[PDB]
Design a protein around this ligand. Structure first.
Ligand SMILES: C=C(C)CCOP(=O)(O)OP(=O)(O)O
Ligand SMILES: CC(C)=CCSP(=O)(O)OP(=O)(O)O
Ligand SMILES: CC(C)=CCSP(=O)(O)OP(=O)(O)O
Ligand SMILES: [Mg+2]
Ligand SMILES: [Mg+2]
Ligand SMILES: [Mg+2]
Ligand SMILES: [Mg+2]
Lengths: 249, 279, 295, 242
């Protein structure tokens, strides 16, 4: 619960720091390092490691994906935050470019994590690069960031807002869980279930990020989503098999 | 070779056909419309051609290298869509026509660009046929290396932070040109060369070829500007810049010596072209 | 003893869950948001419930009838969306909220309505399980016949054109109500009985059944339009008091209309004697509810 | 146009007349009949009969589907023209309701072998639904005469006409008993041919549609027709060529 989920985030951050070394030219790696760890963590990364271990995989098998996922998320975060709305350590131009350096670095980490002594690595990695690129592409995350700008604080329906959160956060979390199951060696039914769970978990999650502003927070939407989420976990019976149900608290 | 212009024309055409099919208009319409606006604006497509050329050079066929070919053009496209943004170079035009954010707005242009960047990986990864997985993954890694913090983006970032610093030395100028131009040509040749089944030794020669002609391009544009800040002529003189160009061109071509002459011809043709342009 | 409220509560709850899962938000967002705004607004769900009850009455099970049940609730909803539009009745309240067109525009409202009707056909066709293709094709046909020019629509068009006749006979007012309200309730009951494995004789009895409650439903809708306030009904009430529409509370009065609703009910229930009272209890309760509801 | 297509278009008219006869109450069947033929002829309807004839089957097997496709088109057409942008023969409410009755009649004709009819109802219903032709009607309300790009306009055409044509071709190949690989080819052919027809007619509006867009759709269509042969294959090709 508290300790397990925290150790996951700490492992993900420890992998990132080891991977992104501030070295010359600091004008490039300084902002790349700063912006990667200034973005809030995304449960999508966490879910990736959790799902890999849930199916019998070793945590190290999904670390590169978990990291790729946080990086796509961070780039997205930086880009939605410019305009000069507030004070930023790095100027708008270096933030945008760095967002463009963070995404490919995610793929580099993944391609570079193929162990040639492991014969099942290429196929599983190729498939995950496809998942992450789709989830953070024009039919996923990007769809949500775009539609989000149509939301008028107190004059937008709940149906539309949930759609924005399914695209903005749900697609990514579904990705996270599925990639975790794939890298863990899970069979298709397992992967599908975990994907679906992730989809609802992420949508619910995003729904809470929305609360703050458009306070119209309906407990029914929260019940329909958590309910659907849990109705997907029918097969995995245990703690981790029923722990996932902890964020939904 | 014969009709090098007709060869380039055929490659761009075939590539323009694959790009149109790969990036279709779809919901959310303004994001796709924006991607297509800058991706299909037509151009020479030297990057896709370098990728294809490199594939057939080592024995592969155009078909196999096509998705990766479109990928590098996608990348090139979004790097330009972003370079024009208000916070960057803030331009209203590019190739006589309005920049992406001028017709779609800043927000959409930023996001359209991000879409082209991630779709490039999705497309290479899921559409490449006729190649084992470790081969396509290896190529995704090469693409990622050539466009990130040790490739394109670095060039773009070091350029952005060096515009108020009038005094800049040769080493600094070569860094920017290498990363901002060569890095993506090198990635193009190495994706083709590896998807075509080439050997490490063949891939390595090609990597040198790309680096030589990418730099060659920047030195020649500096020579023509003066025979029509910091430039090769201002640092070493036109005389030297031209010596350097000829040397860059010779070394590039020396790399294609042990390849079949017929497959190598288009590439050799491309080096001379960049080397002897009149504009 | 049969608890009708507990029955209607779980069946409505089950139908609203399938409706919500059947019509999800997706591009084009406005079209879908407008489809959902009216569909999940909050109707009594009499039609799908009749579909499911008829299915379970002949041996079938809810899951086979659910897609069809949602389909009649989709077409029912779109027929109301269009009915409220400025060129039709121009109403401003429906299912407790502003009418669709007032919230999305006449254009989207029209479109969303059309999408519901179309999708109803897709859904039943592609999602129904526990019935062979022939059954499905057949059901789709009854659905078609009940809402088209020999069904719902005919009733609604003869209703807007017969909005002048001040000499309307009980045969012109009969045609109106049977087509614009009975035909869909007939289709709802029939759809479920066929998908339930029912035999020709049973289906025929039930069709005759739906007929009586179908006319009963309308007769009662006209009384509610003359005795309850718009807030209460959740929709715009009263415009049948002025407009020269063909209603029962006009050609015979409200009290004689009530009386009539009473005969209609007894007749419907007398059709149900075809079945064992134990299995007929749900449809018997739905028939009363249709009779004594207050909205 | 061409007599082969005018001939097939006319067999469909005869069947629609044969099926929709004015009768009491006439205030219902008059508008139904009138509005069915007030809608322009759609090639989505004749493609069905053709695609079916191109794969060994006889058009008499795809007639009902061809008719349904037309009626689905009629209803959409009626609806996209409520106001009195002009003087209609019937009031906005009778037109509105008649469209609502046209579509079900198309399904009624089909419902009236059953595994393919089921598949066709799914095709037509999906093509006339929120994710097909209606997405096109909806997005079209946005096209500003000289402020809208060809990319956006081609899209609306793909949704408004393309999907119904792709669907017509598909239902025809399905009804003639063709194989999956063939249905897709034909479905794609319809898609492009239909998008093309939408561009021709959208040309009348703002004349900026270069032959480049037209050649692309043309080329894309015929490429899909590759693999087919015989008289009927060239007749099918003259739908885009000529
Ligand atoms: C009288 C007719 C034909 C329609 C209104 O019926 P309903 O009373 O069934 O309305 P809802 O419950 O669905 O809201
Ligand atoms: C070549 C790359 C990566 C970016 C644009 S370079 P630039 O802004 O110096 O000049 P242009 O706008 O390409 O004309
Ligand atoms: C019969 C159909 C399709 C719609 C309603 S007829 P009506 O206007 O009498 O009913 P409403 O008051 O609008 O509920
Ligand atoms: Mg620049
Ligand atoms: Mg520039
Ligand atoms: Mg009304
Ligand atoms: Mg009423």
């Amino acid at each position: 619960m508290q300790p397990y989920w925290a150790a996951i985030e700490a492992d993900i951050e420890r992998y990132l720091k080891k991977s992104i070394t501030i070295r010359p030219p600091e004008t490039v790696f300084g902002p790349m390092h700063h912006l990667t760890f200034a973005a809030p963590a995304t449960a999508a990364s966490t879910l990736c490691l959790a799902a890999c271990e849930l199916v019998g995989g070793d945590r190290s098998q999904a670390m590169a994906a978990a990291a790729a996922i946080h990086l796509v998320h961070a780039a997205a975060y930086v880009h939605e935050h410019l305009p000069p709305a507030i004070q930023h350590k790095y100027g708008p131009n270096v933030e945008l470019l760095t967002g463009d350096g963070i995404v490919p670095f995610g793929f580099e980490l993944l391609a570079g994590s193929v162990d040639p002594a492991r014969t099942d690595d290429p196929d599983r990695i190729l498939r995950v690069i496809i998942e992450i690129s789709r989830a953070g592409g024009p039919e996923g995350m990007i769809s949500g960031l775009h539609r989000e700008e149509e939301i008028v604080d107190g004059n937008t329906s709940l149906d539309f807002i949930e759609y924005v959160c399914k695209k903005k956060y749900g697609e990514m979390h579904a990705c996270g869980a599925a990639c975790g199951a794939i890298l863990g060696g899970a069979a298709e039914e397992e992967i599908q279930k975990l994907r679906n769970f992730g989809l609802y978990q992420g949508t619910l999650r995003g729904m809470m990020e929305m609360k703050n502003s458009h306070q119209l927070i309906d407990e029914n939407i929260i019940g329909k989503l958590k309910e659907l989420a849990l109705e997907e976990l029918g097969g995995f019976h245990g703690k981790n098999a029923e722990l996932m149900s902890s964020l939904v608290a | 070779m014969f009709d090098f212009d007709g060869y380039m024309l055929r490659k761009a055409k075939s590539v323009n056909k694959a790009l149109e099919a790969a990036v279709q208009m779809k919901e959310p319409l303004k994001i796709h419309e924006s991607m297509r606006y800058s991706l299909l604006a037509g151009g020479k497509r030297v990057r896709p051609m370098l990728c294809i050329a490199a594939c057939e050079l080592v024995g592969g066929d155009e078909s196999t290298a096509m998705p990766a070919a479109c990928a590098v053009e996608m990348i090139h496209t979004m790097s330009l869509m972003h370079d024009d943004l208000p916070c960057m170079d803030n331009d209203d035009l590019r190739r006589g026509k309005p920049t992406n954010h001028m017709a779609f707005g800043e927000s959409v242009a930023v996001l359209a660009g991000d879409a082209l960047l991630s779709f490039a990986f999705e497309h290479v990864a899921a559409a490449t046929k006729g190649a084992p997985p470790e081969r396509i993954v290896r190529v995704l890694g090469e693409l990622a290396v050539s466009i990130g913090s040790e490739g394109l983006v670095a060039g773009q970032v070091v350029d952005v932070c060096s515009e108020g610093m009038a005094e800049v030395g040769l080493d600094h100028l070569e860094f920017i040109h290498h990363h901002k131009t060569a890095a993506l040509l090198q990635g193009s040749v190495v994706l083709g060369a590896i998807l075509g089944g080439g050997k490490e030794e063949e891939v390595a020669k090609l990597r040198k070829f790309a680096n030589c002609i990418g730099l060659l391009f920047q030195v020649v544009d500096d020579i023509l500007d003066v025979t029509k800040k910091t430039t090769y002529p201002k640092l070493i003189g036109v005389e030297k810049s031209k010596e350097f160009a000829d040397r860059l061109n010779r070394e590039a071509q020396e790399q294609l010596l042990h390849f079949h002459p017929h497959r190598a011809a288009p590439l050799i043709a491309l080096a001379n072209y960049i080397a002897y342009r009149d504009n």
